[PDB]
Design a protein around this nucleic acid. Structure first.
Ligand SMILES: CN[C@@H]1[C@H](O)[C@H](NC)[C@H]2O[C@@]3(O)C(=O)C[C@@H](C)O[C@H]3O[C@@H]2[C@H]1O
Lengths: 157, 205, 129, 79, 82, 123
RNA sequence: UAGGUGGGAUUAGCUAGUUGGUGAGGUAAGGGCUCACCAAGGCGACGAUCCCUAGCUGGUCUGAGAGGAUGAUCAGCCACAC
RNA sequence: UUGACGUUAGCGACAGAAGAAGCACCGGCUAACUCCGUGCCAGCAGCCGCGGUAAUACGGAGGGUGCGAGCGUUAAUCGGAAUUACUGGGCGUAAAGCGCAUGCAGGUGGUUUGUUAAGUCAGAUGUGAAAGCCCGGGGCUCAACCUCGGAAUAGCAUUUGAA
């Protein structure tokens, strides 16, 4: 499987005695639409090579997230650098109500119904890190019951 | 208003068939369907998420021949209604009389269907309805007035609709020229080419 | 001055769990012990014990699972500087129902679940998740 | 018998206690509970009460421009 | 005086009357004491033409409420309905 | 800020300002041109930009831009002004509504005509 | 009667029928409502006084909400009629 | 005998595609690109900017996009703005710790028994106009609209409990 999205391309510069070496950063996200998601950030002097590098990096850095059949089990907060993300489970039909970067991550991860907001910096590179920080923080009701030595019933009763 | 202008052009933009002609000739034989309209038609590339969403919304509007103000109201109802906003929107579009006289086969297109409806050809439960956008309910009986039972366009369109797959939520006696909207279609019943999700997303954006 | 012993209890637990401490001791009190009892019931601590008669100390044994601390969140809600009382229909859900909120009702100190089932509101002490 | 308790906060008027009634209210915005105070000139026929006393007053007919409360009962006299 | 009278609501050309107890001095469509029923002069299908709480009508008449001629006829109609 | 601080002094609403103070919250305003001149943009930009000093009905004197190629505005012309900064021209906060009162449509415009007051070409 | 209902502290004191008492008058009716007399009270940092703005409400608009903005039409209340 | 509306709605019958499409935009944001004219001029512009010779930014044209009996502009409110942050922000260096302290009012306050029940919580009763909003219906060919029932009115008063 592995759906791969390109969140951002950006032209960066190193100043040099000559003039300016201009290069390209690519922020990509990969996942299986069913719990795995990874990001990759690649650099190169050509755009295709950056995307390629990012994709390769992404594949290696993928991570399980506990989803509730296309939504979250509970609300989560993420933070990275100055980017803060809130995401909340939603009813089916809602769609991914996330903003930029955050929606790419949620697409490939397999979230179809979520409510989001991104506070603070909306810098793609940081949002993506916050989003996957948050998706990492999610636990299934079973996991939460396992940890508290109770049953899914008793947790919710 | 109703969009009165060239039909296949729309299909070319949307990059698909919207069934805006009767399927007696293949859309590809009547137009360069794989090129968009105009002088930059053979130059397609990156569309934005916004553009992607926009297109999907327009795909569905243009299929059913609804303008934006109406379409946006449908979305608002689909939202208000209980359950899946995406599905509700499709069942709202599928419940329209101009669509329902097309699904039954009285009209060869959804635009002929609409003329039939406007021109007072159609009864619903034996009363004359000439509002395209009327919401045919479950177990309603859409029929053709005895006056119009002799229109050869109708007879034509029935055999055109034989060439398509049957709606399993509509029953039609084309001999008596009456149909029953048995029930509202499910999401499964309709095209899975439609990504309703994107249209919901467009109307949050 | 220390003007919120409950928050001090929670801090001590939160910092203990962070430092991978086995147990945490603090000056005991009724409400501290009551909280500790609920946290045991809900499976967030291992156990507690109140030693001493003159100046009683409380010892919460902390709980780890897969070498992560069981308590993720331990946020105090009703501070001294801003008390928080919710009616039964307005009780906070924590971690989408998977965490507790310790309510103090007039029939004792209970989770938000048990408070809702009891149709009691009360003072919101903290969120445990 | 909807009375209200309070504390005498002036007594210098003849036959009149100013009584400070104290309500504890949640703040509309910020959520904090907050002492707020109604002063309410009551009528004291006998000049019983003294600055500091805790009295129970009851609403009555207007007895002056500012007095439409009356002393029911002194609850706790001052030190 | 207190009167039981029709208060026109509805739309242009489609009058729908609330039967109200009111001080006579008010505008017919303004301050009323109690709504005791309604009268749809052009009711179709399942829509009721006349609801009127006769108990409340009698209550008010017994307190010296007048009835308008129209409400007086609808009271008869609500009694031939009873 | 602490709650008790906010209870003592609540968070202050922010006084916003209109960029079009002369309009006095009206969609347009009539004025009489007192001077119809040209001015040079702020630099990076280079042009001769057609403007009018206008005395409005509310007694404000303001400078309005006169947009589109060519105009018929002398001193004493009665014009309608709307809001609209010209970024290049420091001072100019209003546009002269073309095609309204004494101001005429831009001659021989054929796209965006409504914005310039020109009627539809008789085809 | 109580609570609620704009802005300004580069507006901090304000009040002397003023605040309360007694009696008389007066009113449909309690009441400084008025007068005489006695006392010196009353209000105010939980913002009196002053200044600016403003009819109030049901609602309306916006907002995930909490809020923010607003008070045409309709209905209630108030005020006014060169 | 009583209809202002009134030549009423609603129905039929005729005849014929017959009588009926604009407006903004197409440099990025933002859906839609080319060619000519122009040459820091003329002009554009919400923001970033565009124009000094191959201008997808100016003007026209062709083509396209959006919307449609409208479409644009201006004004105005909220939103986005977590950019006054209660929900929901900050203050080493970005704006922000009073130079330091003492201290009244205020805010807050250790442990514990009992009591009280002001705060808190639960319930009852009264009230919270009607309309509106929302949910189910009902009636207009549909819709707007009208309308029935409910929910709501997060409050307040009285009252009974919990502690
Ligand atoms: C003195 N010779 C210099 C010296 O080799 C410089 N490197 C330290 C070298 O640096 C270059 O290679 C650069 O990259 C910069 C450029 C301006 O000059 C180039 O040529 C530079 C040579 O001219």
């Amino acid at each position: 499987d592995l759906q791969e999205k390109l969140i951002a391309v950006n032209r960066v510069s190193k100043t040099v005695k000559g003039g300016r070496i201009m290069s390209f950063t690519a922020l990509t996200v990969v996942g299986d639409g069913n719990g795995r998601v990874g990001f990759g950030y690649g650099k190169a002097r050509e755009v295709p090579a950056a995307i390629q590098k990012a994709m390769e990096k992404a594949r290696r850095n993928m991570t399980t997230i506990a989803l509730n059949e296309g939504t979250l089990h509970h609300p989560v907060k993420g933070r990275h650098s100055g980017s803060k993300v809130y995401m909340q489970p939603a009813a089916e039909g809602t769609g991914v109500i996330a903003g930029g970067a955050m929606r790419a991550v949620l697409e490939v991860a397999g979230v179809h119904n979520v409510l989001s907001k991104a506070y603070g910096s909306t810098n793609p590179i940081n949002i993506v890190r916050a989003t996957i920080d948050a998706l990492g923080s999610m636990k299934s009701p079973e996991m939460v019951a396992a940890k508290r030595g109770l049953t899914v019933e008793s947790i919710s009763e | 208003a109703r969009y009165l202008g060239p039909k296949l052009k729309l299909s070319r933009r949307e990059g698909t068939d919207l069934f805006l002609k009767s399927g007696v000739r293949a859309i590809d034989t009547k137009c360069k369907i794989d090129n968009a309209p105009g002088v930059h038609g053979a130059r397609r590339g990156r569309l934005s998420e916004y553009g992607v969403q926009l297109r999907e919304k327009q795909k569905v509007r243009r299929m059913y021949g609804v303008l934006e103000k109406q379409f946006r109201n449908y979305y608002k109802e689909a939202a208000r209604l209980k359950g899946n906003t995406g599905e509700n929107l499709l069942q709202l579009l599928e419940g329209r009389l101009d669509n329902v006289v097309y699904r039954m086969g009285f009209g060869a297109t959804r635009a002929e269907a609409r003329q039939l409806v406007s021109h007072k050809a159609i009864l619903v439960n034996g009363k004359v309805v000439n509002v395209p956008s009327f919401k045919v309910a479950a177990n309603d009986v859409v029929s053709i007035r005895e006056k119009a039972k002799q229109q050869s366009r109708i007879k034509a369109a029935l055999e055109v609709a034989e060439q398509r797959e049957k709606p399993t939520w509509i029953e039609v006696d084309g001999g008596k020229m009456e149909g029953t909207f048995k029930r509202m279609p499910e999401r499964s019943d309709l095209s899975a080419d439609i990504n309703e999700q994107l249209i919901v997303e467009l109307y949050s954006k | 001055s220390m003007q919120d012993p409950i928050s001090d209890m929670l801090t001590r637990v939160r910092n203990g769990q962070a430092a991978n401490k086995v147990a945490v001791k603090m000056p005991s009190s009724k409400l501290k012990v009551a909280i500790a009892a609920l946290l045991k019931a809900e499976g967030y601590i291992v156990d507690f014990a109140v030693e001493g008669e003159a100046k009683p100390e409380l010892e919460v044994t902390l709980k780890y699972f897969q070498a992560k601390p069981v308590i993720e969140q331990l946020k105090r809600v009703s501070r001294p500087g801003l008390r928080v009382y919710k009616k039964k229909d307005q009780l906070p859900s924590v971690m989408g129902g998977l965490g507790i909120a310790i309510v103090s009702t007039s029939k004792g100190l209970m989770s938000d679940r048990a408070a809702r089932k009891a149709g009691l509101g009360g003072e919101i002490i903290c969120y445990v998740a | 018998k909807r009375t209200q308790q309070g504390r005498v906060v002036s007594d210098k008027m003849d036959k009149s206690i100013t009584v400070a009634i104290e309500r504890f209210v949640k703040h509309p915005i910020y959520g904090k509970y907050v002492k707020r105070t109604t002063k309410v000139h009551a009528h004291d026929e006998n000049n019983e009460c003294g600055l500091g006393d805790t009295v129970e007053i009851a609403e009555c007919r207007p007895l002056s421009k500012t007095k439409s409360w009356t002393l029911v009962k002194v609850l706790e006299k001052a030190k | 005086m207190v009167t039981i009278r029709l208060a026109r609501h509805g739309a242009k050309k489609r009058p729908f009357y609330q039967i109200v107890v009111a001080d006579s001095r008010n505008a017919a469509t303004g301050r009323f004491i109690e709504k005791v029923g309604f009268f749809n002069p052009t009711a179709k299908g399942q829509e009721e033409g006349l609801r009127l709480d006769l108990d409340r009508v009698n209550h008010w008449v017994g307190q010296g409420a007048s009835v308008s001629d129209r409400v007086a006829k609808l009271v008869k109609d609500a009694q031939k309905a009873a | 800020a602490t709650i008790n601080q906010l209870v003592r002094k609540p968070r202050a609403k922010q006084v916003v300002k209109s960029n079009v103070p002369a309009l006095e919250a009206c969609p347009q305003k009539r004025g009489v041109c007192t001077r119809v001149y040209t001015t040079t943009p702020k630099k990076p930009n280079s042009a001769l930009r057609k403007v009018c000093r206008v005395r409005l009905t509310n007694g404000f004197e303001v400078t309005s831009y006169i947009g589109g190629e060519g105009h018929n505005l002398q001193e004493h012309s009665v014009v309608l002004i709307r809001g609209g900064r010209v970024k290049d021209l420091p001072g100019v906060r209003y546009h002269t509504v073309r095609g309204a009162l004494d101001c005429a449509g831009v001659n021989d415009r054929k796209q965006g005509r409504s914005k310039y007051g020109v009627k539809r070409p008789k085809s």
